[PDB]
Amino acid sequence: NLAPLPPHVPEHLVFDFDMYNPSNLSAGVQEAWAVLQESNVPDLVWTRCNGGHWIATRGQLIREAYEDYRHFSSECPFIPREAGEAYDFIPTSMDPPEQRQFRALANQVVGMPVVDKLENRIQELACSLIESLRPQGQCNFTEDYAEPFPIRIFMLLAGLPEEDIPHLKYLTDQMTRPDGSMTFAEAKEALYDYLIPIIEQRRQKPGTDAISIVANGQVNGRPITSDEAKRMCGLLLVGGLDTVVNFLSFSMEFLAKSPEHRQELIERPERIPAACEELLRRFSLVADGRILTSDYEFHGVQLKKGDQILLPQMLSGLDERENACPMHVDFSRQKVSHTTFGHGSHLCLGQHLARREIIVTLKEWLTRIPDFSIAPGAQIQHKSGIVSGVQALPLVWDPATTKAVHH
């Protein structure tokens, strides 16, 4: 339940929001979080849920905090406090100047250059999966495409066997949406337990895979340590297994419910890139933050050192003061504003890989199965957390309206 209110917190700023189980969850997870943006709610509130933590509710506040790493440190970036204290992935748990040097190395395995070179394989995997489903006329998109497409692309790049997916997927989820069987520390260590033997074997006999590059990598001329590689590889695992997988579900759900917007893409393919950006805004899904490094007065609110402050990357784009008709999906929006991939020194290094994956999915799915919808009488349940997702997305379509395309 609720944590006792700290001495310095004003009772008029208390809004008991629960990020792992928001009250208005059945209306759609993004809709649940938007309640923090209704007229009466202040720009910065305090929830007593999950141990108690501040919550910036507007883009202006969120963007500001992410830029000011001096007052807002990534050292303890997650809610609750035990999860953030135990979290030490690189570069996410570091602030500049220390974190900068590690980004370049990560870019060596997921940056635009590597992505450009993966295009052929990515499109090839997307098409096989889709054509594999096209004749059945149904599928549960979460397990049939959303998880396999991105995860297999990563497992491949990482030189990790596909049979290890179920185990790894489970562990990453305990970090973003814990079912209660594991603490944050336990899941993290279980992941490290998996990676350690591999980072050691890749440093003895390195291959060309992602982990080999990282384990034998150099940051600012000096060679990376075994511990650092572990912490960096753990972050890459989470990105390939619980980011795009969740996003594709939100996107296909919307498309399933809006024959209008899909038709807009089928008829005018060139706008798919722009459509992707708008879908990333409307269905943003990440929510992490920072921890106060000192007593600081922020927008009239007294914050004390050690206070945690959630800065939901998902809210900036939904903020009416940033986009005129927030909950409306308009592919022709002239200035699609958002912070879906973060803001500041920690801007997502995988976003380029993310976009190609989203764009390839839209182009290769719409080209084969243009007509489809939500299964008969199914009510789509969303899941909330550090990274929100879709519990299940069963779809259906008439095989006769589909077309077998050749890649």
Ligand code: HEM
């Ligand atoms: C649609 C999918 C994705 C979303 C929305 C997303 C979101 C984010 C966000 C918001 C951050 C910054 C968080 C913070 O400020 O603490 C971030 C960091 C990062 N992301 Fe992603 N990401 C996505 C996919 C990926 C993928 C697929 C990978 C790689 C396989 C990845 C790798 C990274 C890395 C390495 C960082 C750390 C950068 C740093 O610490 O400076 N992300 N991502």
Ligand SMILES: CN1CCC[C@H]1c1cccnc1
């Ligand atoms: C805060 N991050 C942004 C993308 C993934 C997310 C995250 C979630 C769990 C563990 N590490 C990172």
